[PDB]
From a paper:
The m1G37 modification also prevents the ribosome from shifting out of the three-nucleotide [name] codon frame (‘frameshifting’) to ensure the correct polypeptide is expressed. The absence of m1G37 in tRNAPro causes high levels of +1 frameshifting on so-called ‘slippery’ or polynucleotide [name] sequences where four nucleotides encode for a single proline codon. To address this question, here we solved six 70S structures of tRNAPro-CGG in the presence or absence of the m1G37 modification and bound to either cognate or slippery codons in the P site. We further show that ribosomes bound to [name]-[name] pairs that result in +1 frameshifts promoted by tRNAPro-CGG result in large conformational changes of the 30S head domain, consequently biasing the [name]-[name] pair toward the E site.
Residue numbers in the entry:
A (entry chain RD): 2 to 273
B (entry chain R7): 1 to 47
The structure:
RNA sequence: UGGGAGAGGGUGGUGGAAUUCCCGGAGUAGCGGUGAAAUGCGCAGAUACCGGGAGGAACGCCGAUGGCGAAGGCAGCCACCUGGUCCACCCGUGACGCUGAGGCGCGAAAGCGUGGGGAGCAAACCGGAUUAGAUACCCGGGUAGUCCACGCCCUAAACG
RNA sequence: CCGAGGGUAGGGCCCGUGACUGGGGCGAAGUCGUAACAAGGUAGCUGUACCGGAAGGUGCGGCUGGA
RNA sequence: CUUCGUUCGGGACGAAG
RNA sequence: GUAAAACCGG
RNA sequence: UGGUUCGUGGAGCCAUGGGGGAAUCUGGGCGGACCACCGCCUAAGGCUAAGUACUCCGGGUGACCGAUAGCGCACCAGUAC
RNA sequence: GAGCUAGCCCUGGCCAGGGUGAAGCUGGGGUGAGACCCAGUGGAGGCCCGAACCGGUGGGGGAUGCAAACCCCUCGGAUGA
RNA sequence: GAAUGCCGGCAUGAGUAACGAUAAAGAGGGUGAGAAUCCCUCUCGCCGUAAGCCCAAGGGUUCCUACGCAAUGGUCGUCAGCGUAGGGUUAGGCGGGACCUAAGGUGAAGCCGAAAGGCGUAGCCGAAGGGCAGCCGGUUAAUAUUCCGGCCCUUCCCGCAGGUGCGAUGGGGGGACGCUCUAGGCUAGGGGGACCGGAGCCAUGGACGAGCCCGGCCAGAAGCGCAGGGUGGGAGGUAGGCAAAUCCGCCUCCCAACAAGCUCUGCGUGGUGGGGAAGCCCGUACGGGUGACAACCCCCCGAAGCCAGGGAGCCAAGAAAAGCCUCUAAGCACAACCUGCGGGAACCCGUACCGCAAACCGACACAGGUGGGCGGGUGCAAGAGCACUCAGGCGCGCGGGAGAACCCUCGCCAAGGAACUCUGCAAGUUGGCCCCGUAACUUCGGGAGAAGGGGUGCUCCCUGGGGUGAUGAGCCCCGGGGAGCCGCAGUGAACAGGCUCUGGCGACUGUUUACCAAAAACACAGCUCUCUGCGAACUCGUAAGAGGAGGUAUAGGGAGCGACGCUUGCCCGGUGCCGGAAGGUCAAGGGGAGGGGUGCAAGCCCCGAACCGAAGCCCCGGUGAACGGCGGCCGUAACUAUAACGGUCCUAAGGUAGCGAAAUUCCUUGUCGGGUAAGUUCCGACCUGCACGAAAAGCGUAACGACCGGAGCGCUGUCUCGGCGAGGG
RNA sequence: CGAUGUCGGCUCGUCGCAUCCUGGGGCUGAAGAAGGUCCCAAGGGUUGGGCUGUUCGCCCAUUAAAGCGGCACGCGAGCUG
């Protein structure tokens, strides 16, 4: 339900912001937050290792339950749905009946005032977490562990969903949001439903500065450079690239695969 | 305009002072030469 | 008041046949295609056969000189929501009616924007034949489109 | 004060004209193809979109002004 | 370029040069 | 269920 | 691969990173690929003065200098700057 | 050597004064319900003018300079990258 | 005797340029051997969102006083920020440390590296951040929130007095937070006053008058008063806050929905303490006395500061730890902790002075640069703008004359107005506010301050709103109408757009070559391709490790294009990349046919052919928003001309759409049309495109631009064509 | 080549004459007027604009005429750029 603006500037003409309409609660839970180290793209040697980063708004980290098998059988009430600046998706307060408060990453058509529960027992309804051997084939699902007891590491951006395509022994076959077909162990936990804020795709930033508020510095093309700096640099008056097109460090950027070929993961993988 | 030397006493001793030479092996060898040269100040003198 | 018929509309779900693709088994010197050929595909193991898997689109028989709708149009099945219409009883209001310049809404297909999806078909495009020449008819590939959600476009042999 | 009218600046409508250019109509009997009329030799027509020297062709849906 | 053959005639096509 | 095309005449 | 005069050369000898992997005097190394004979040594543990190098320091000496020379400094010089 | 300069991290501060008047609400108009239309409130924006602050557009002076980058007039940004 | 030789000395320019902002000087009197330059007085000018005060950094004795002038001072100097000597910096409350954490640094455990060393959880260090208890005056030649006076506070330690289960680095709460806009009430600050208190003055024509001039405060405990912030109170149940909790969290019924009540600040009043002008009289360069028993009152403006953790809206979603409160654990409950009182103890470092500058950074007493707070009044609509001026500080450390050329910085001009010139370069026109009125075009916001106009002062009268005051006088902020006065002229000074038409490029705001280029370059939202399934790809590093990221295909990396509208055509022959368990080729290795060297031989040691041998290459396909590329010659139509048409050679294919003498066009000032009297430029066309063309994007596009070009209007010393005056040389 | 700053414009001249004009003359297919061509002659003069960086050139409006060349394609310790 994406808000547009009237063009009372040049930059308001194209800028869209999100609707923020599922958000119920506008300051985060104090025992579940901790400060974020901003980096600049700089590593422990202090060298830039990802370029064109830095500058952002200040952020506090939200601690997210990415396991959900801490609390098998203990149900929880969805207390609030909140902004996280640290992911594309939204997050949900769970007031557990223990009175832990935890953040889960908030699925689509989760509404506030709702029983969720993790387990095998754990009926098939949106927000509940199960082993993948117990979810039916053909249902959409997210927050998927890759290897079991290791953490939700799959399908947790905004709008995303994996879909269960088959079982094979201990392993189940997932359709990833990339379209990859993928053997995942059935003891890996996974939280049902798609994620949403699925209008995160349709955001238009409007101006340069809304890139700078997210910590995205200007990105320099190597055609605009010198041959010390880039392959593509040089040339009096706008060369077309000289050569098959290429990184600053020399490897090609149109088509060249770098999946490492003897990966042990490559025999759990069926598709792209 | 604004020139090169903009002094700072915290800066001068945390960079050129005696405890900062005696971390690096390159800076203990600074003081060894300035022992051997004869220097009346090993280190830039800060209050 | 009491019933009836119907592919009438929207939403959610769901069943099978078939095409294509992937995998496994077995199996060979050809398969497709045409008026005839050729491009193409195939000993790097194809077509044809069996078994498993994925995905999309349309719903055979019923089925027509049928039905519904104001028109465009609507066809597997199930549930919900809902409009229109017909009959019987002659119970109530009691002339409350007919049409309709503007307005408003709907409006096949193609086409446009945003995203999704894409098995088959197939503008444009590429070949191979035909021809005197082929920007065509025929054949082999094939991108938008065809499908969905939202918003546009307002057209026709929108015909009885 | 108003004031015929003169002046300054900016709009609206109309007419004549204009290098160049689009298509229309009529001509001498020109050049190129064969689109339609008979199943006109791919049934024809139409809305739309694309392409093609050109009539036109194809895709989607529609019509009988054909079987 | 030329002669013949098919055609009502031309163009196409067929055969000898 | 159909049947390769084969132009024109001041 | 390094060392030795040895730069792959007929390339031995001495050390070694990787792989295979013995024996205890009838055992093992070497004598410049290799083999026979003839000879020389006894690896896979360690220590060991003297004779040798240098001059911060002290002394003696000089066909060494004599304040632009001699150490950058004869003089409160690694100082002023 | 990042006490100049380039970028980034942590923690503070600064931006006089005026205009323009987005969204949204309130009342009314409208509708079957709407979309929508008026006012009023509202105070948005890499909005406008213009001092501090940040720059350095054009010209003139300066050229053993006040200055190894200056001065006068003028000009750009000035709630944002 | 030379090497633009090295070191030192001294000449030339030459008594020449210059003596460091054009803010400005004059006189009288002192001291002195020596006064334009030092002291005093009078007059004049300059700053006054500073050229005036208070801090931080930096500097380190420059502060004060006494005695001096050899050098320093761009002149002098009796002076000094200079030489000699003496003095001067006083803290439980101010800043920092015996408190805390941030980035970052360090680092027991642990990981890594030939060595040196590199990482690294806890912990430690680490500050203009969080925390914490002093305000107002008076004294010195020089210190004071430090000494003194008055009035308030903060910790510990020891005692009694009264209460409770006390009790940790452990649990919880809290500290704790963004940007923009803002309400209520105060305060700092300011204005006025017929009211109050003051030495004094009627000047020169008038005035002894509600006359002129000066000043009418500050701090301050308890207690009140006014604003305002934080916060529910009980009862059960409990598996969570890595042991235990009565605490916190969660669940469930009751009492308010409220600041009602508890605290906690701010601001008034407050026991009391202090200050107190202008003028006059003096003896210093600095000050003192008097004026005074000082008065210390009332209205108005009003903060960006205070109550403060206030409220509302928004997205880009906004530090940590300690102090504080609460809870229990061992241990302790003759302890311990809390409240009140009494007594006692309260360390280390800094404190002078400059501090937009002569004391910091620029070799200089250098027109440059340097963070924070205060920054008065009047008028111009406002304002930190501009002009003048309180307080306060200055006339910038060479002067005196002259009145040439010439240069700088100004001022003005007949008639013409761009004829100047590469170009209106420069300079002039315009200029603030109020009110009329405003085009093409458009992405419907704009263009717009379009353009072009009218008014603006002063006096008198009537009259409408507010706010503070009772609904009222007053005081303050906004208007309306009528009548009249003066001047060439009413934002009368200062600060304050010239405009319009039309192209090129770039969408735009923005960024860039510090120190010759600010642009059409870069960047930018947005489009596409490609890689990447997570110990991801990519990057830094030998490694450990780290960024990526405490992210997960709506995400991250790389590349090109660069909002938006309509679009991005053909060629995969070579190169790149992607896909192929066939085949050819290919190293180590396996393999041993066979041959060789030595032995009397068992043996030892060498070559060494078939054959099995990976990637890669060859080969087979695909792929352009991958590297790239995208033809030539003849004939042909009722007048020439031209060629829709056809034939032919070659290529992998033979430039499609749209533009085109272009930021691309050599011949070229192509040929027409328009502007002009005249147009190598410009605009619109033709296409003969040397040598446009589709994401090294094509063609357009409103708005935007200190970009680049053309034209007109206004106006001017740019010019015809110069002249005169001014100040600094 | 241990430096001789280059085109064009402005300012400032000066020189040569193979003379554009004005002055004198011969011949003429010189009736007159106006011309053509040749000789003598440098004393003076030789306009203002549109285009373009232009030198040059093409135009516009005049003129008695709108002269050609040298002086480092004169002239940057004179200027512009
Ligand atoms: Mg670090
Ligand atoms: Mg480091
Ligand atoms: Mg870029
Ligand atoms: Mg470049
Ligand atoms: Mg480099
Ligand atoms: Mg390179
Ligand atoms: Mg080029
Ligand atoms: Mg090229
Ligand atoms: Mg290149
Ligand atoms: Mg009845
Ligand atoms: Mg329609
Ligand atoms: Mg359709
Ligand atoms: Mg579509
Ligand atoms: Mg998109
Ligand atoms: Mg097909
Ligand atoms: Mg042919
Ligand atoms: Mg086909
Ligand atoms: Mg019909
Ligand atoms: Mg016309
Ligand atoms: Mg014909
Ligand atoms: Mg026909
Ligand atoms: Mg037809
Ligand atoms: Mg037909
Ligand atoms: Mg076609
Ligand atoms: Mg059809
Ligand atoms: Mg034919
Ligand atoms: Mg060697
Ligand atoms: Mg060797
Ligand atoms: Mg050797
Ligand atoms: Mg060799
Ligand atoms: Mg070995
Ligand atoms: Mg070994
Ligand atoms: Mg033995
Ligand atoms: Mg050996
Ligand atoms: Mg030996
Ligand atoms: Mg041997
Ligand atoms: Mg031998
Ligand atoms: Mg031996
Ligand atoms: Mg031994
Ligand atoms: Mg030795
Ligand atoms: Mg000696
Ligand atoms: Mg001597
Ligand atoms: Mg010496
Ligand atoms: Mg820095
Ligand atoms: Mg404002
Ligand atoms: Mg509104
Ligand atoms: Mg605003
Ligand atoms: Mg702005
Ligand atoms: Mg602006
Ligand atoms: Mg300020
Ligand atoms: Mg600065
Ligand atoms: Mg800059
Ligand atoms: Mg400048
Ligand atoms: Mg200059
Ligand atoms: Mg401006
Ligand atoms: Mg501005
Ligand atoms: Mg000599
Ligand atoms: Mg010499
Ligand atoms: Mg010398
Ligand atoms: Mg001299
Ligand atoms: Mg003289
Ligand atoms: Mg001289
Ligand atoms: Mg002179
Ligand atoms: Mg002089
Ligand atoms: Mg001076
Ligand atoms: Mg005297
Ligand atoms: Mg003044
Ligand atoms: Mg200090
Ligand atoms: Mg100093
Ligand atoms: Mg001193
Ligand atoms: Mg004295
Ligand atoms: Mg002196
Ligand atoms: Mg002197
Ligand atoms: Mg004296
Ligand atoms: Mg002094
Ligand atoms: Mg002194
Ligand atoms: Mg202590
Ligand atoms: Mg400490
Ligand atoms: Mg600490
Ligand atoms: Mg070590
Ligand atoms: Mg470390
Ligand atoms: Mg650390
Ligand atoms: Mg602090
Ligand atoms: Mg304190
Ligand atoms: Mg003092
Ligand atoms: Mg004090
Ligand atoms: Mg005291
Ligand atoms: Mg307790
Ligand atoms: Mg705590
Ligand atoms: Mg806490
Ligand atoms: Mg006060
Ligand atoms: Mg007051
Ligand atoms: Mg009085
Ligand atoms: Mg008098
Ligand atoms: Mg007063
Ligand atoms: Mg409660
Ligand atoms: Mg517990
Ligand atoms: Mg309340
Ligand atoms: Mg008081
Ligand atoms: Mg009080
Ligand atoms: Mg007094
Ligand atoms: Mg708030
Ligand atoms: Mg915290
Ligand atoms: Mg601590
Ligand atoms: Mg406690
Ligand atoms: Mg101590
Ligand atoms: Mg002090
Ligand atoms: Mg002081
Ligand atoms: Mg300051
Ligand atoms: Mg200065
Ligand atoms: Mg200085
Ligand atoms: Mg100094
Ligand atoms: Mg300097
Ligand atoms: Mg120095
Ligand atoms: Mg000086
Ligand atoms: Mg001075
Ligand atoms: Mg400053
Ligand atoms: Mg003020
Ligand atoms: Mg003021
Ligand atoms: Mg005022
Ligand atoms: Mg006035
Ligand atoms: Mg004003
Ligand atoms: Mg202020
Ligand atoms: Mg001012
Ligand atoms: Mg004064
Ligand atoms: Mg004039
Ligand atoms: Mg005049
Ligand atoms: Mg005029
Ligand atoms: Mg001109
Ligand atoms: Mg001229
Ligand atoms: Mg111009
Ligand atoms: Mg100008
Ligand atoms: Mg004016
Ligand atoms: Mg305009
Ligand atoms: Mg407007
Ligand atoms: Mg105006
Ligand atoms: Mg007046
Ligand atoms: Mg009132
Ligand atoms: Mg008030
Ligand atoms: Mg007037
Ligand atoms: Mg003005
Ligand atoms: Mg323009
Ligand atoms: Mg142009
Ligand atoms: Mg731009
Ligand atoms: Mg520059
Ligand atoms: Mg530089
Ligand atoms: Mg600019
Ligand atoms: Mg510049
Ligand atoms: Mg785009
Ligand atoms: Mg590496
Ligand atoms: Mg991370
Ligand atoms: Mg990591
Ligand atoms: Mg991506
Ligand atoms: Mg990306
Ligand atoms: Mg570009
Ligand atoms: Mg292309
Ligand atoms: Mg190709
Ligand atoms: Mg290819
Ligand atoms: Mg190929
Ligand atoms: Mg390959
Ligand atoms: Mg071998
Ligand atoms: Mg071999
Ligand atoms: Mg072998
Ligand atoms: Mg291979
Ligand atoms: Mg002809
Ligand atoms: Mg042809
Ligand atoms: Mg084409
Ligand atoms: Mg032209
Ligand atoms: Mg023309
Ligand atoms: Mg013309
Ligand atoms: Mg043109
Ligand atoms: Mg052209
Ligand atoms: Mg070109
Ligand atoms: Mg191009
Ligand atoms: Mg090109
Ligand atoms: Mg391209
Ligand atoms: Mg472009
Ligand atoms: Mg264009
Ligand atoms: Mg464009
Ligand atoms: Mg448009
Ligand atoms: Mg444009
Ligand atoms: Mg600009
Ligand atoms: Mg700009
Ligand atoms: Mg002049
Ligand atoms: Mg003059
Ligand atoms: Mg004069
Ligand atoms: Mg003068
Ligand atoms: Mg030379
Ligand atoms: Mg020379
Ligand atoms: Mg020279
Ligand atoms: Mg002559
Ligand atoms: Mg004559
Ligand atoms: Mg004559
Ligand atoms: Mg005559
Ligand atoms: Mg004659
Ligand atoms: Mg003459
Ligand atoms: Mg002469
Ligand atoms: Mg002109
Ligand atoms: Mg020009
Ligand atoms: Mg020339
Ligand atoms: Mg001449
Ligand atoms: Mg020459
Ligand atoms: Mg010359
Ligand atoms: Mg020059
Ligand atoms: Mg020149
Ligand atoms: Mg010269
Ligand atoms: Mg220039
Ligand atoms: Mg130039």
């Amino acid at each position: 339900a994406v808000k547009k603006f009237k063009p009372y500037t040049p930059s308001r003409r194209f800028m869209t912001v999100a609707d923020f309409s599922e958000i119920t609660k506008t300051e985060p839970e104090k025992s579940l937050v901790k400060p974020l180290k901003k980096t600049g793209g700089r590593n422990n040697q202090g060298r830039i290792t990802v370029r064109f980063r830095g500058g952002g708004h200040k952020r506090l980290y939200r601690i997210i339950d990415f396991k959900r098998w801490d609390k098998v059988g203990i149900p929880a009430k969805v207390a609030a749905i909140e902004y996280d600046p640290n992911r594309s998706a939204r997050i949900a307060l769970l007031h557990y009946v223990d009175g832990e408060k935890r953040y889960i990453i908030a699925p689509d058509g989760l509404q506030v005032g709702q029983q969720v529960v993790a387990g095998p027992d754990a009926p098939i309804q949106v927000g509940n977490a199960l082993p993948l051997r117990f979810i039916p084939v053909g249902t959409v699902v997210h927050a998927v562990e890759l290897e079991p007891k290791k953490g939700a590491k799959l399908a947790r951006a905004a709008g995303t969903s994996a879909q269960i395509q088959g079982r094979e022994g201990d392993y189940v076959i997932l359709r990833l949001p990339s379209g990859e077909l993928r053997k995942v162990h059935g003891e890996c936990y996974a939280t049902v439903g798609a994620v949403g804020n699925a209008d995160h795709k349709n955001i238009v930033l409007g101006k340069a500065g809304r890139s700078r508020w997210l910590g995205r510095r200007p990105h320099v093309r190597g055609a605009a450079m010198n041959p010390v700096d880039h392959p593509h640099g040089g040339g009096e008056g706008r060369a077309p690239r000289g050569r098959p097109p290429a990184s600053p460090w020399g490897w090609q950027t149109k088509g060249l695969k770098t999946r490492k070929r003897r990966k042990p993961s490559s025999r759990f993988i069926i598709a792209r | 305009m604004k020139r090169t030397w903009q002094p700072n006493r915290r800066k001068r001793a945390k960079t050129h002072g005696f405890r900062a030479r005696m971390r690096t092996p390159g800076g203990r060898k600074v003081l060894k030469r300035r022992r051997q040269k004869g220097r009346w100040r090993l280190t830039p003198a800060v209050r």
